[PDB]
């Protein structure tokens, strides 16, 4: 459990729109200060959208350690036993708005299906390859029809439903049904993408290769809030069904995070200042600095299972469903062995 952040990190920022300063800090805020120059943001928040302690109830959703409970930039907060081997999995309770993965020196978008059949590893992305019946990608309307006879899921919010759908595929080696894949929901196309690869960062020169001529070598990649990801939500298996009320999403206009002390909201007494031209660029920096469950580079050298420690998952070609009716679903083609 050495790598788990449990949500601790530089998760919050006060963006001064007039001085173009992103004031980043790593303690939970406990009140808000009215100030027309400011917008209050968190690493989980959408990067653009804006809206004896009397603040306790209102500020609960900014207590990231309590309401999310895991990393943000890299979320690998739980372990799942499969056939005697313990794999790392995303486990945060809130959706991460605007997060995606950039594959370095690559044309491949990360929601492209993982390489299968005759494809080289670097030709494919992170998403589930086609299955029969087709499980991913699936649109919202398709998901509600798929689950139309399941009372407990059919009416879930679209993000919670995408999370539960991604969790509806049990690898056939996983007899205790512990392993649940993460997912990305694209609000533009209203599509749920189950992610076959649960890793989110691989940047060590000893463990990845950025050369495009070595197309079966492991590629390098990192999480980011790129402008092209603004409609995505990165979702672990644990996304809660009431995230809309308990998790952050919109940024707070005309508001500065503060700390409640002796009946008054005081300024955060020490912040780390980064320049940022607009709110999106501040949110991107807060995310870059936020809680991470990634092993530090020196820790990846000291382990004998570097791939597992960054989230490498089990080899699975056929699956069974968790929710009724029980059915078997197989990939149309097996994933590239290089994985």
Residue numbers in the entry: 3 to 53, 77 to 364
Tell me, in the authors' exact words, what the paper reports:
AMA1 binds to RON2 through a surface exposed loop (RON2L) to anchor the parasite to the host cell membrane prior to internalization into a parasitophorous vacuole. Here, three single-component AMA1-RON2L immunogens were designed that retain the structure of the two-component AMA1-RON2L complex: one structure-based design (SBD1) and two insertion fusions. We determined the X-ray crystal structures of SBD1 and insertion fusion immunogens 2 and 3 to resolutions of 1.80 Å, 1.85 Å, and 2.10 Å, respectively.
The SBD1 immunogen is a circular permutation of AMA1 that contains a Gly/Ser linker (GGGGS × 4) between the original N- and C- termini. The DII loop (358-TDYEKIKEGFKNKNASMIKSAFLPTGAF-385) is removed in SBD1 to produce novel N- and C-termini at residues Lys386 and Thr357, respectively. This new AMA1 C-terminus is immediately adjacent to the N-terminal helix of bound RON2L. Some of the residues deleted in SBD1 (360-YEKIKEGFK-368) comprise a helix in AMA1, which is replaced by the N-terminal helix of RON2L (4-QQAKDIGAG-12). This design approach ensures that the RON2L sequence (3-TQQAKDIGAGPVASCFTTRMSPPQQICLNSVVNTALS-39) could be appended without a linker to create SBD1. The SBD1 structure was most similar to the AMA1-RON2L complex, with no major structural reorganization observed and a Cα root mean square deviation (RMSD) of 0.299 over 245 C-alpha residues. All groups had potent GIA against Plasmodium falciparum 3D7, and there were insignificant differences in IC50 among the AMA1 DI-DII, AMA1 DI-DII-RON2L complex and SBD1 immunogen groups. Strikingly, when the same pooled IgGs were tested with Plasmodium falciparum FVO and Plasmodium falciparum Dd2, only pooled IgGs from the AMA1 DI-DII-RON2L complex and SBD1 immunogen groups showed >50% inhibition at 5 mg/mL, and the IC50 for the SBD1 immunogen group was significantly lower (i.e., more potent) than that for the AMA1 DI-DII-RON2L complex group in both strains (P < 0.001). In conclusion, the single-component SBD1 immunogen elicited potent strain-transcending growth inhibition that was significantly better than that elicited by AMA1 DI-DII alone or the AMA1 DI-DII-RON2L complex despite lacking receptor blocking antibodies that prevent RON2L binding to AMA1.
